[PDB]
RNA sequence: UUAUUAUAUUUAUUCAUUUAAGUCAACAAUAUCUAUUUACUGUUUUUGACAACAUGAUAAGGAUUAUAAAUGGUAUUGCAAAUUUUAUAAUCAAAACUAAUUUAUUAUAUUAAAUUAGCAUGUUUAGAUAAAACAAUAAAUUUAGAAGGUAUUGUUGCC
């Protein structure tokens, strides 16, 4: 490693006959370290989690845009009466992203 | 209250920095240490703090904070500040709660208005 | 008044040398004078907002107007009822004080200059 | 007030017979828990750098291995210098004598001349 | 202390 | 000495055979003592609690010790209503209390609305005693403790811990089960909309919509139905065909016209204040008498699921039926129940609050006057010959 | 509101202020403030957006410390392990215990009287960017045309 | 403002060298004196005396305040709503509001004593 | 090197220092429930009052 | 509320010295001006005369 | 090194001179030989510059006085408003005279 | 000036020397120390998580209506975090008889799932294993049928076949890799904990070949797998080929876990073997390689009098 | 490392004093007892 | 409430009366 | 991947614009003259207004050329200690040319001092200007004031 | 005994205290994604700080540099940083004087709680002898300035 370097002077009768410090003096402003961070997997986990949750809302909508096959029944097989489930297919399909349909 | 409060303090030099300068040395010898600087870059996406000194609008070191500025939230007591009766205060007066100063202060006493 | 407040924090610095603590007690002042001025100013920006002609925010909560009227025996005859109005008046009857105490602070914050710091 | 040391509170009870073996006293005794004596228990220790941490942990991180206190160094070097120059004072005193009173199967020490 | 483990069977991955 | 020092209590002897004491002058004592004087503020305290009394390797909580008679006393004492007697005795408890303790403890906080106490009980057993307090029965009390206190704030704060965070629900695996969560949620929904809590009520309901727990009342009712049929050998199916015919799913149908004709008037009579032309075609909502109300089954449910699409109207009427009190308002008080449900289909819906908005004034766009900042030139559509141009131009 | 703060807490300053560390990290400290104000306001903290909770949970772990950790967090191991971690990770210049600064900048001679004896009244470990030899005075970009490391004369 | 306070408790970091500080916060706090828990009731018929205040009296003579009171009461064989409100010394209407779930009294079920009971 | 020692800690280092250490969760001082006279002071033997 | 920012800030004594300086500040000086109590009450009786 | 700080960064002044004038030739060195023989009638009784005392900080281990201002000295003018009698914040009374007139007011 | 060193945090002659501040100077802040917020470290404690569930979760998947109806017939099974002690025969009887009544293929799985948790906790996986034979493996595993098991099923049964040693993990587990339902990643770390030890209990060194290969392949917490487990999956290995594979494998485990492996392995084998309900087969070669491998990944403390004791000064 | 000019260095090792002067009155009077006592000025 | 309040970094919030440093 | 360098608007507004809406809005704010909202993603706390003046004074060694002559008197007050600034109260006067002629400046200060004693009489007698006034009251007050 | 400055000056005296040895290493348990790490075991070769010799180092002590804010010293006093080569000597409860380097309370009123002092009454009486000039109050019987040494840190000198 390169970070490491000789932090202690070679044992000698200087260490005894000298008021030089054995250890450094503490720095008032050096905030106390403490474990606060995310690992690789813990990141990859919370990464992987959010992927799952977005799928469900996609899967909900994309499986619910099957209201096209609900719609497809009307126009071609039997159109409808103007009762709800005509407006409900109107309200949904408009808010479902089938602006034209 | 500086005259031209908009420009004098809205300048990149607080109205006191000579942006109108080539980076050239003057006739003196003490300045001959530095010379006339090479042309400023023509295609330069420069750093927000710095500049190319080509003009006032581009100082060598920009000063105006990019974030927009609010005016200082003034220390006037609007609660007892004399105010003129707006048309609604002519209109919506019966729906006002005010201290007897408000109803009878010389600065638009709202009682003769209410009576009127 | 110059000593009216809702919360009074007292910070007691402690240094081995007098001139240390003084120069420090001078520093935190010109620190708290900054954060103190700004933080109180935002609420003052909120207070004047919570009052004006089409500035509602003290529009009384249906919950609050209940608590004033959640009392078996009130001020003047029997069992009492306040209308939402005087409730919305009682509130403004108090913000007027939280302003006078607020703006009276910003003023005493801006007085000390480096020329005449006391 | 007219007295010099006016503290306003009654400092001492002027009951002369007041002792610590008394019942009422012990009701109002201050437990030594978390007082001057606690601070002196943990701060007033022989090697004031040990209260901060175990030294080995420090010489494990800052240094690479545990190093002995400055005394053992001066003990160690001075043994070497005398032993390099002189002999005949070397008293082979060890904590456990087994290693010496019975050397292992190998380890035939070179005859020291 | 090297080699620790026998690397792999001799191969021609291309 | 050689084995990790485990202090024994019964086998303590003058000679101290196991050598589990910080002796003074034995070899290798310096490094041992210097660890003592560097012990944390809670070292003899936390170690003794952590060394023993840890969750079971199989997963459960290590309840049983000879201390169980103490716990029986509490559930013998708490159920009687002697709450302070329980607590001033509960301090003697040492091991982890089983969940039946707190069920009895928080049960005593219900009668006097001692909401401050139930929570203090909760936060103790919650995350400080290995999450044993995480029980759908326990929070069911605190909620009923907050209601009597009428403190809507903590109601959601109970809901805050009810669904829990990723910690309490994943690594601790102490999640409030599906059935108990529905009850607590329904208890939550039940109070607010009677206290007319507008926004906070709309929040929690979406959770039931999101977790699709919206129809558990049918499920918990059909669940009780399936109890016998399993014992008797009948084949049980959970399908919509039953849910279209359950007694609860039936009475809601029949009671709808009163519901429909109530909300219409309660819409009308209110807007009568804001917009004068109530009782006129100048209103968004449509007459239920000019559709399948009064004989609801025709179109009233089609009228509800129309005017209130954001919330599910069939669900809230299953909630509006009873109170917390289990008194079936539907059968025992018709006008109260409907005018009750008039609140729930109203407040839970946000779209319905939109149609319930009064006409406001039209602000006049303005360009600033020359004199002063606050003084502004008004945009009269009149006082310009060119009639087609607007303020934006 | 929070989506603003965690965004604002990331907004980086200009060059002149980013010379020590990101200055706007302090705004995530305002999350334990608001998270708590969210409870008393009756707004559930478990209804914050899923994605938002990736960062709000980060703020707490960054800026919220319970006492029973505050009583036992500056332990001997809990600090050296953090140094031990960096030693494995390879960046220890910022750590005080393992900081070994050696270059002592000389005193700039006042040409008033270059015979004026100089000394050191104080010494303090600042990084280079305060007084690094005038970047034009010093030679061309050297991290690329050279590798530079201080070692002691054996 | 708690946002301001956490500017304050961060002053301890950047203080001038060798200078510790201590904070004296002094904040108003709203306190409920609910008479339901602490009832301002008459004297006890047997007045306690000095015999109840020897040493260790706090240990053996007084259940730490507040006094425990029963909030749960079982309706007896034929009590009515006014008859229960009788024995609890409370208002029948307050009793009707107190126990929401209790519309009909069934002998043997415990009524929840109202908070305002005497 | 030239004597310009800051009379005041600059605003920058204020933010940088004040963000290296976390808020104590207890100094938040929020309480709308009240005080628990029966139970709070009698809590479990581990974290007891 | 007094936390330490001196030699007592970081190492193994971080706890017990912190515990001391708080158990040494266990006081909470509850105060209330009696004249404030001279308000009405929800029963309608004058509270404190 | 933990000691690489403690070396000296510059070249210390060097010893190429004789004993200064009249200094060591018993005689306690601390007293300036000629400066103290300078008659007080001409220089006064002052030892440290006549400035408001609060500037000086009682030194440690070095028995003298040192200014908490780094060698700068603010005259008495800065300790008062413009043209203050006897350099008081207010002209009207002294310390005690402003102590007890406070109460009487 | 002596053996007792000077405390650099409390000495003026030091603190007020030139190599630090003097008490006169403006005394401001020297340099802001942004450590925890520029390069922050994550929280890897030594004291294990106090409130971690410490087990597999079976995660009921029945419809809410069933939960209410199935409540008593499910309550003999382990509830959320709480497990009674009914005999497994009392359970499997209850399921088989009540199975046809439940019109749900899904609910019965969750029903059958808790039974696995029940039998596994009761170590009676052998009988419930037959329930896998009668009920589950046909409709799900047989010949790549379209009906894929809901996650809890294999989640449960893999604990069942693991807690009580039964070699029927290999058929199901192999259908959980990339080829089959690919339920491999969703596993928690405890899942592989009991899984590996079961192999080590059994001795399936070739099963250690499979599951370990998936661990790195899946990017699971290969460090957080409990040491008591990995000791078993290593100790069962005696053949040459897997022995080579394990040497390549350890360089995935972090040095900290590696330093505790040679601590727990040297414990479960020799000193505190009493913990182990199963007496370990004693493989010395796997034993030595680990103790050597750990003292390599760790830093090498320089002990001079060891290495150079007999070293010869070559004067030529 | 800040600096301002020197007046007299005073190496008071246990051996002796060697008091150099470049006279002024004073300012802060520094001090170092690392190994050799010196009184900067 | 940013870390550096608006009082400092702003033209309109400038304290015209605040005298510079090398004057006093 | 570092968020701080990611937010950096140095190389341009490019990497911060994804949605076609904002890019469309990017072209509006630039046109009408407002600030592009994306540029603020990397905030520029410009050097504070004093630190500009402070940098100036240090360069000119107290900048004697621009300090008023009152500062060089004894006991200078904060009014004089700040630099020379053409304050607004010189606005109305026009007889003053950029070169003050014989006594021209002396006349002005009286006109200033006169207006100040007007700002007094306007106050104590209740003729202050209000934020809500209109031109109809403005003449109704000023003429009433000039009385 | 040379032409802004004082010693003659009270107030005191009987005084002692010490015990019964023990250092050859480090180890999160609650609310941050799971390690049984639960109970992290590897068998043993030295002699200074001592009961002993083992260099440094800060005190006590008045005798001839203030008139507009000061009366206690360096040569050294037990435990301190390079000389080792018999040896555990450390306060813990309940305990025994031989010691130069110390205010002890002297006759109206006298033991209240961790255990605390019974013989010495004899004219505030031998010889020796103790300490002030400082917010107090004594200001004169009186002073630089000429002088020798067989010693050679010098009269406790040498002869």
PDB file of C-alpha atoms in Angstrom, chain B residues 72-79 88 95-99, chain C residues 41 44-45 48 52 85-86 89 92 96 99-100 103 107:
ATOM      1  CA  UNK B  72     -35.623  42.376   1.819  1.00  0.00           C
ATOM      2  CA  UNK B  73     -38.724  41.499   3.786  1.00  0.00           C
ATOM      3  CA  UNK B  74     -39.329  44.938   5.186  1.00  0.00           C
ATOM      4  CA  UNK B  75     -39.763  45.698   8.873  1.00  0.00           C
ATOM      5  CA  UNK B  76     -42.934  47.780   8.503  1.00  0.00           C
ATOM      6  CA  UNK B  77     -45.870  46.909  10.757  1.00  0.00           C
ATOM      7  CA  UNK B  78     -48.554  46.437   8.144  1.00  0.00           C
ATOM      8  CA  UNK B  79     -50.786  45.576  11.117  1.00  0.00           C
ATOM      9  CA  UNK B  88     -63.719  46.592  -1.700  1.00  0.00           C
ATOM     10  CA  UNK B  95     -67.223  42.424   7.084  1.00  0.00           C
ATOM     11  CA  UNK B  96     -64.268  44.159   8.765  1.00  0.00           C
ATOM     12  CA  UNK B  97     -62.992  43.860  12.328  1.00  0.00           C
ATOM     13  CA  UNK B  98     -60.754  46.771  13.237  1.00  0.00           C
ATOM     14  CA  UNK B  99     -59.405  48.575  16.252  1.00  0.00           C
TER      15      UNK B  99
ATOM     16  CA  UNK C  41     -38.042  36.598   8.686  1.00  0.00           C
ATOM     17  CA  UNK C  44     -42.803  37.131   9.353  1.00  0.00           C
ATOM     18  CA  UNK C  45     -43.216  36.505   5.634  1.00  0.00           C
ATOM     19  CA  UNK C  48     -48.353  38.955   7.023  1.00  0.00           C
ATOM     20  CA  UNK C  52     -54.531  40.047   4.546  1.00  0.00           C
ATOM     21  CA  UNK C  85     -65.722  34.970  12.672  1.00  0.00           C
ATOM     22  CA  UNK C  86     -64.610  36.125  16.128  1.00  0.00           C
ATOM     23  CA  UNK C  89     -60.693  37.406  14.990  1.00  0.00           C
ATOM     24  CA  UNK C  92     -55.650  37.628  14.192  1.00  0.00           C
ATOM     25  CA  UNK C  96     -50.722  40.958  15.654  1.00  0.00           C
ATOM     26  CA  UNK C  99     -45.637  40.211  14.493  1.00  0.00           C
ATOM     27  CA  UNK C 100     -44.884  43.072  16.898  1.00  0.00           C
ATOM     28  CA  UNK C 103     -40.415  42.804  13.754  1.00  0.00           C
ATOM     29  CA  UNK C 107     -34.867  45.773  14.171  1.00  0.00           C
TER      30      UNK C 107
END
